């Protein structure tokens with residue numbers, strides 16, 4: 001034989017369950033950058049690129065998932081903590097006729113590139129000066145090594161380290177754990193009795209399932225990046241003081257009521273993304289998130305409060321078993337592949353969007369949020385703020401931009417009228433054009 005494969009196997013770790021599903025899904029279309037997540041922080045002040053690069057180096061040392069390198073092997077793909085070659089581009093676009101548009105185009109050209117996992121770079125950090133005392137920190141990752149909460153933790157840590165370095169202070173000891181402990185915990189869960197309990201619960205929950213209700217007229221795999229319809233809204237349109245749990249309950253209830261009013265289906269299956277972070281996993285950047293199948297049963301004449309109680313019940317009974325992958329449940333239920341458990345996902349991310357870099361305020365804004373197989377309702381909300389950002393992310397094959405926009409406007413209106421009177425049956429509101 002040849003020793004190279006043996007040394008590859010002995011110097012690597014197996015992928016986690018979520019990483020395995022990500023890799024299996026990406027292998028079908030290796031030229032599709034739909035598995036990139038991306039955001040950018042607008043900083044209202046002066047950023048020194050050298051101090052920022054120093055902070056980025058420190059955080060890359062602190063979050064070892066940023067140094068994961070992947071290697072092919074007889075066992076598909078494996079990973080180790082390697083030495084990625086990275087750089088921080090600094091682009092001053094203040095002289096351009098449209099500095100904001102130039103920065104948007106730069107980051108779009110970045111996150112549109114295909115990402116080969118065995119060569120990298122799996123992440124990209126760059127600074128874009130869009131105005132005097134207005135900078136942009138652009139972050140991009142592949143979902144195989146990062147999710148939403150991980151990127152949020154990394155942005156917070158980078159902000160803190162930069163603020164500490166600017167005032168010449170030693171940054172406090174980082175709170176992060178190692179990605180290897182996360183991988184070991186996932187490997188232990190994969191052969192755990194907790195996993196058997198979760199599998200039994202999810203097999204009983206969606207035992208006799210139904211094909212998902214959807215606003216699209218066709219089912220198609222995700223190939224292009226999402227079509228995004230973004231709208232901002234005030235919290236009083238909801239009015240329910242909601243927390244993350246009840247905000248997600250209300251969003252899922254509204255989406256299920258809209259799907260029932262548009263399709264007539266009464267057993268609406270939605271997708272609910274969750275962190276799957278308990279204990280030490282709450283302080284380890286990387287990929288850990290899952291999507292739960294949330295069933296909402298519709299009865300004609302039912303109001304919003306009953307739907308919200310249904311959603312609260314489903315979450316209260318299902319979040320205990322959120323470690324079981326939805327793909328493993330789909331395979332275990334005996335469903336033919338291509339048949340999904342849910343079509344419309346409701347991704348509520350109650351992560352703080354505010355940061356402080358060297359005394360200057362800054363705000364986070366998403367560009368990519370993973371693949372959009374059908375419809376994804378992304379709800380960005382800083383806990384406490386009176387504002388919500390609502391993104392309709394759609395598969396370009398199943399939707400067109402203006403149709404998605406009309407659906408979003410009608411859904412916003414229907415949801416506002418729903419929250420106006422939670423006792424009125426959903427079959428009564430007249431909807432829009």
Ligand SMILES: CCCCCCCC(=O)SCCNC(=O)CCNC(=O)[C@H](O)C(C)(C)COP(=O)(O)OP(=O)(O)OC[C@H]1O[C@@H](n2cnc3c(N)ncnc32)[C@H](O)[C@@H]1OP(=O)(O)O
Nearest residue numbers: 037038039147148151244248273274275319320348369370
């Ligand atoms: C570059 C930037 C790009 C952006 C990246 C985007 C990438 C992605 O697409 S990843 C998707 C990101 N989204 C998310 O992370 C999902 C966020 N949202 C959510 O998780 C849900 O909508 C939400 C808010 C309902 C979860 O609510 P939350 O209250 O936090 O629940 P969670 O912590 O998951 O679980 C709590 C429940 O766990 C259950 N549980 C059982 N055992 C335990 C235990 N030992 N410890 C804790 N909880 C336990 C309990 O029943 C508990 O409920 P409760 O304590 O109230 O009885």
Ligand SMILES: CC(=O)NCCSC(=O)[C@@H](N)CC(C)C
Nearest residue numbers: 143147273274289290291345370
């Ligand atoms: C919603 C779905 O099943 N398809 C996309 C999965 S994309 C991914 O790995 C995560 N970042 C998002 C979920 C699992 C929290």
